[PDB]
Target: n-acetyl-d-glucosamine kinase
Amino acid sequence: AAIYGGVEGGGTRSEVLLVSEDGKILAEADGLSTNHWLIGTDKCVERINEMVNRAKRKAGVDPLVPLRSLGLSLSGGDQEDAGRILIEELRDRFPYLSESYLITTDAAGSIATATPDGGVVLISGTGSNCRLINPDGSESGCGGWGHMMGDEGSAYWIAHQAVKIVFDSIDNLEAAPHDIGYVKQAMFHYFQVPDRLGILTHLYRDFDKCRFAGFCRKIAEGAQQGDPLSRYIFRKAGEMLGRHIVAVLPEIDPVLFQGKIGLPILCVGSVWKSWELLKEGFLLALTQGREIQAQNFFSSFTLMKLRHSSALGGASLGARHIGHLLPMDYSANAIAFYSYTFS
Amino acid sequence: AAIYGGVEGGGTRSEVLLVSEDGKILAEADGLSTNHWLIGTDKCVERINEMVNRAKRKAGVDPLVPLRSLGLSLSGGDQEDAGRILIEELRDRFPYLSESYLITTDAAGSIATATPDGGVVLISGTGSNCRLINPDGSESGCGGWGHMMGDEGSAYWIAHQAVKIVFDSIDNLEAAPHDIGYVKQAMFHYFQVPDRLGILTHLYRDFDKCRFAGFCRKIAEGAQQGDPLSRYIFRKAGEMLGRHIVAVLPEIDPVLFQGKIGLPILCVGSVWKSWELLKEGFLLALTQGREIQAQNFFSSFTLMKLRHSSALGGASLGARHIGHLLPMDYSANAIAFYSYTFS
Ligand SMILES: Nc1ncnc2c1ncn2[C@@H]1O[C@H](COP(=O)(O)OP(=O)(O)O)[C@@H](O)[C@H]1O
Ligand SMILES: Nc1ncnc2c1ncn2[C@@H]1O[C@H](COP(=O)(O)OP(=O)(O)O)[C@@H](O)[C@H]1O
Ligand SMILES: OC[C@H]1O[C@H](O)[C@H](O)[C@@H](O)[C@@H]1O
Ligand SMILES: OC[C@H]1O[C@H](O)[C@H](O)[C@@H](O)[C@@H]1O
Model:
């Protein structure tokens, strides 16, 4: 049995799948965090090696035989490649783990799970990113620069607009579009501080990007219960997300438009659980972005969700990096959830 | 002889002025940081006592003779109610230091040095902030929230605009108002990196707020040398600083608009060195904002810079606090660099 493995990590979820020669998924094991910014490359190496061994036991596979390849689909933030270093520390500490390594990106590992010839992903999790891989080599992207330089339409951004808007309102630097009450109270309560000064501590001493972006869930709840300000912030995240697509539009190979689905857009990230709250902003940004840019027309799009971990894409790409091609059941890996054709 | 002290503290450099009954300066001593975050409060207490005693000795005043008052003008604003405590530990440990104390914001100390009545303090350094002090002493503000949640029109905000605009241009998420070329080259040079990926380490792993805000100076040169885009960023900075004034306007005591000087606005910070580049933006924001809000006065304003320590202001406030009006040469204390009367 020749085994190929993929890893999903870098963000909040971490996971390993192992795949056989024939593309049959052998086992899945969940793991501890592999965000290399919060944890070092020492721990990263440790949790990856545990994860894979546990999965090997689970699959009924020879514990001593090294993986043919291991495809690591990781949300970089900075591809400052210490991904190079991760591979080096990996083959240094555990030489029996795998014969070969591939570090890719979360976007490329997702795309790889859904289609055999590239496509388009829109990511909205704690951060955001939009990426494209054409049927030929060509790649292209918009805005995966993290929290200090963009992330428009992410959980961070939704959270940041939320506090930015109350700060500016009280200050009289800008008038809010709708009442400040619910969010102002949600804020103080979530961060457990009485006033605006209390919020500074969480920004510059503490700073917990994870806690901060968590605030998005409270805006989502408030929006669901009809608080206009909350509904507003989710509309604008819809636009920002829609704009990422508009941005990459000129770079898309025309054949990707010309099917029954039309342009398939893979939607990765938990913010998409609030799709109903993003829908209008998203539809708007696209609708105004096809007047300004292209009479060279795509007629429709459909949105898709993954049904297996991006680790499956990882495994796929890890095999591709060596000799092999892993068979893939692309119908099973992703499903349609929304469709729209411009009228 | 009655003697009246002030301290400019809270930042990295401290100062003490001993002022006599008819306003002449008796002694002055420099000191290091008096920031309780960086140093703890005990060390702050020690260093204040040390500075003041060194000022007494210079003046031929024994350590056992207390001041009639001491006005501590303490930056690191907003959260300066560790002041009640710094005063207690002071009159606990060193009872002969002073017979009276006043904790002042750095803004209150600052204006009290330039004019007798209230005014506005407008800061644009690494960060930015705007504080209004009324004739009656009541103080309020706009901004001061730091690089993650405002600092509009500061050194940091300027550098950040520069690199955001070019990031969004290459991404095609937002077309720049003017050509990206000059600034793009300035960026790559200043952070000494090959590409955008290289800028990302300077924002996450190797982050240095001071280094990053330093990039402002480069945009100043660009704007000086004639580059359309660098000029534009400095116009927007001017606007944001303008809008800080517009924010507090509704709170100003009408009588503050009434001098021959009009509204006194003290400018603190190094970005003010680029006044020529902020001027148009500053004016445009003041024009369209004083119109929105019925201009029942606000006929004019003059912008000032300081020429003495805010400690002089501190001395003055400490003395008023105990019923003594300290003679104060406001002309020697600060100079006016611009005057504008709306027409
Ligand atoms: N229903 C929801 N609506 C909007 N945001 C959500 C929802 N559930 C989770 N989130 C946000 O998802 C973010 C985490 O993104 P996720 O894709 O789960 O992980 P990561 O992006 O870190 O890999 C959290 O910051 C949280 O606020
Ligand atoms: N001539 C200038 N024009 C514009 N910005 C400047 C100039 N000189 C210095 N700066 C900016 O001022 C910032 C430092 O501000 P300063 O007021 O001196 O100290 P701080 O704000 O840290 O107390 C630096 O980030 C620098 O980029
Ligand atoms: O996860 C979505 C995005 O979050 C952040 O912006 C990261 O810099 C980027 O690599 C990631 O893809
Ligand atoms: O120094 C200018 C300003 O910079 C930062 O924004 C600080 O939060 C603020 O308190 C300070 O006054």
In short: Chain A touches chain B through 33 residues (CB under 8 Å). The first strand of chain A starts at residue 4 and ends at 9. The CA atoms of residues 23 and 328 of chain A lie 6 Å apart. The two ends of chain A are 53 Å apart (CA to CA).
